[PDB]
């Protein structure tokens, strides 16, 4: 998305951290996924964390 809007804009996003591998696979098929967002100033790449939580 190019900010053709006529002012600065706030943009939120997220990454899903699943409970187990079965969730991971039945949601996104493959494992060892990545989420990468970037702008001119920004560069992020998170590798999600499967784990059993409270």
């Amino acid at each position, epitope marked *: 998305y190019n900010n053709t809007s006529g002012e600065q804009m706030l943009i939120i996003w997220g990454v899903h951290h699943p409970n187990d591998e*079965t*969730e991971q696979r*039945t*949601l996104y098929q493959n494992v060892g996924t990545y989420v990468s967002v970037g702008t001119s100033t920004l560069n992020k790449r998170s590798t999600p964390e499967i784990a059993t939580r409270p």
Partner: antibody
Framework: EVQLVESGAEVKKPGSSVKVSCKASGGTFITHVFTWVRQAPGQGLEWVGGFIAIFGTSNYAQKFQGRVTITADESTSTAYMELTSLTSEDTAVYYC?????????????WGQ | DIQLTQSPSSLSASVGDRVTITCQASQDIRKYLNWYQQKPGKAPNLLIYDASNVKTGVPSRFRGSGSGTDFTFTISSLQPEDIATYYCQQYDNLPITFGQGTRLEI
């Protein structure tokens, strides 16, 4: 391997109600996309229902919404459609089935 | 809901031929299509999924091909248990449409 036990056979008289069951095993309760297709005397094939157990969300065709509600229980691993206002564009054989992936993939076993 | 069209509703089972059923949608669906078998008037069964790949409870006797609006379910050399009506069905879109049937005899 994964199978699918439905309910009965009993057609009914217009104004009544149905609550077809469909429980499955051969795997864990998540995944499991429960789809339901009905077959009129002789004619085509007609998607009515769905339930996507990961979400707990549920989808219908819109020759219904109002009438049909579909649910489940994880403990009993049992699905559950409920067709109210039961006329004659409602008279068929009602197949439960297992499909895949949120957008209802391919339906791999079928009910008897 | 995006309206399939299994052409034609019945071919005539001349054994061994290039027996080819077609399935033509109301709009582009790319590769999200399935082919179902109904041996005699009861519970259907799945053969080809996702346009050109096979169920692995597998006939080498069969084939799926297609993408655009247009799809094709092929049986080459006929065999005497494959007596059925036949279905194409869809997602990509949302309320799950089918074809009507394509059925041939002995």
């Amino acid at each position: 391997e994964v199978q699918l036990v439905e309910s009965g056979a009993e057609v009914k008289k217009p104004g009544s109600s149905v609550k077809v069951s469909c429980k499955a095993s051969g795997g864990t309760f998540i995944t499991h996309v429960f789809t339901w297709v009905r077959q009129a005397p002789g004619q085509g094939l007609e998607w009515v229902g769905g339930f996507i157990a990961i979400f707990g969300t549920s989808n219908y065709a819109q020759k219904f919404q109002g009438r049909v509600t579909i649910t489940a229980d994880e403990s009993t691993s049992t699905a559950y459609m409920e067709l109210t206002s039961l006329t004659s564009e409602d008279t068929a054989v009602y197949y439960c089935a297992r499909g895949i992936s949120g957008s209802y993939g391919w339906f791999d076993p079928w009910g008897q | 809901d995006i309206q399939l069209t299994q052409s034609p509703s019945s071919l005539s089972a001349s054994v061994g031929d290039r027996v080819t059923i077609t399935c033509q949608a109301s709009q582009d669906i790319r590769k999200y299509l399935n082919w179902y078998q109904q041996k005699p008037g009861k519970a259907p069964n799945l053969l080809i999924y996702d346009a050109s790949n096979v169920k692995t409870g597998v006939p080498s006797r069969f084939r799926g091909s297609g993408s655009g609006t247009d799809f094709t379910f092929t049986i080459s050399s006929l065999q005497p248990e494959d007596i059925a009506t036949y279905y194409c069905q869809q997602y990509d879109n949302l309320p799950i449409t089918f074809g009507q049937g394509t059925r041939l005899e002995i």
